Amino acid sequence: LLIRKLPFQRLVREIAQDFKTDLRFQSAAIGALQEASEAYLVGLFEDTNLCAIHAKRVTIMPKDIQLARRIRGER
DNA sequence: CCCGGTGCCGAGGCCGCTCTTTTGGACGAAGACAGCACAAGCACCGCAAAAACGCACGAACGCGCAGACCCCCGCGAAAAAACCGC
């Protein structure tokens, strides 16, 4: 895993702090969340690279991300 | 077969009416006219502009280098809570 394990834990807790106050986490929940997040982001970067190559470029730009999320059907 | 007499049909008379042609001879000059405005389409010439391609150049990003930073790695401690049982 490329992201670390403690900043990601803090991010997850911060996000979870909105839906219910003072929620405990479990052995393999944060690990699964990190695996899913990194897999998702790698797929998104694959699609972004495809779009950037389509535009005859090598640099990925935010509009490529936006196009990828639009075609995937993401809101 | 004969008498009294009347009302019905015939070819013609005649009356009021409607239709037709005509309106002197010759000469001169001037002036104003003698289908049109309107209509859709063919075959053609033309300018304004698109989506894309070709060229030039300037700057903002990559590359390269020496520096500062804190993510990452490694270590040891404590015990919440996950996995198991009845």
Curated annotation (Swiss-Prot):
Effect caused by changing I53L? In BRYLIB1; uncertain significance
Whether Ubl conjugation counts among this entry's keywords is yes
Q: Which residues carry this modification: N6-(beta-hydroxybutyryl)lysine?
A: K20, K63
Q: Where in the sequence is N6-glutaryllysine found?
A: K20, K56, K63
Q: Which GO terms describe its molecular function?
A: nucleosomal DNA binding; protein heterodimerization activity; RNA polymerase II cis-regulatory region sequence-specific DNA binding; RNA polymerase II core promoter sequence-specific DNA binding; structural constituent of chromatin
Q: Explain what the record says happens when changing R69H.
A: In BRYLIB1; uncertain significance; decreased protein abundance; increased interaction with DAXX; not changed subcellular location
Instruction: Please name the disease the record associates with this protein.
Output: Glioma: Gliomas are benign or malignant central nervous system neoplasms derived from glial cells. They comprise astrocytomas and glioblastoma multiforme that are derived from astrocytes, oligodendrogliomas derived from oligodendrocytes and ependymomas derived from ependymocytes.
Q: Which UniProt keywords apply?
A: Acetylation, ADP-ribosylation, Chromosome, Citrullination, Disease variant, DNA-binding, Hydroxylation, Intellectual disability, Lipoprotein, Methylation, Nucleosome core, Nucleus, Phosphoprotein, Ubl conjugation
**Record's Gene Ontology CC terms?**
Barr body; chromosome, telomeric region; extracellular exosome; extracellular region; inner kinetochore; nucleoplasm; nucleosome; nucleus
Give the consequence of mutating I53V: In BRYLIB1; uncertain significance
Which organism is the protein's source? Homo sapiens
Where does this polypeptide localize? Nucleus; Chromosome
| N6,N6-dimethyllysine: residues bearing it | K20
Which example biological process does GO assign this protein?
A: oocyte maturation
Q: List the top taxonomic levels of the source.
A: Eukaryota, Metazoa, Chordata, Craniata, Vertebrata
Q: Which residues carry this modification: N6,N6,N6-trimethyllysine?
A: K20
Q: What is the effect of changing P62R?
A: In BRYLIB1 and BRYLIB2
Protein encoded by which gene: H3-3A
State the name under which the record lists this protein: Histone H3.3
**PTM comment for this protein?**
Acetylation is generally linked to gene activation. Acetylation at Lys-63 (H3K122ac) by EP300/p300 plays a central role in chromatin structure: localizes at the surface of the histone octamer and stimulates transcription, possibly by promoting nucleosome instability. H3R2me2a is present at the 3' of genes regardless of their transcription state and is enriched on inactive promoters, while it is absent on active promoters.
Effect of substituting M61I? In BRYLIB1; decreased protein abundance
Where does the record place the modification Phosphothreonine? T21, T48
Q: According to the UniProt entry, which residues carry N6-acetyllysine?
A: K20, K56, K63
Q: Member of which family?
A: Belongs to the histone H3 family.
Which residues are recorded as modified (N6-succinyllysine)?
K20, K63
Q: Which residues carry this modification: N6-(2-hydroxyisobutyryl)lysine?
A: K5, K20, K63
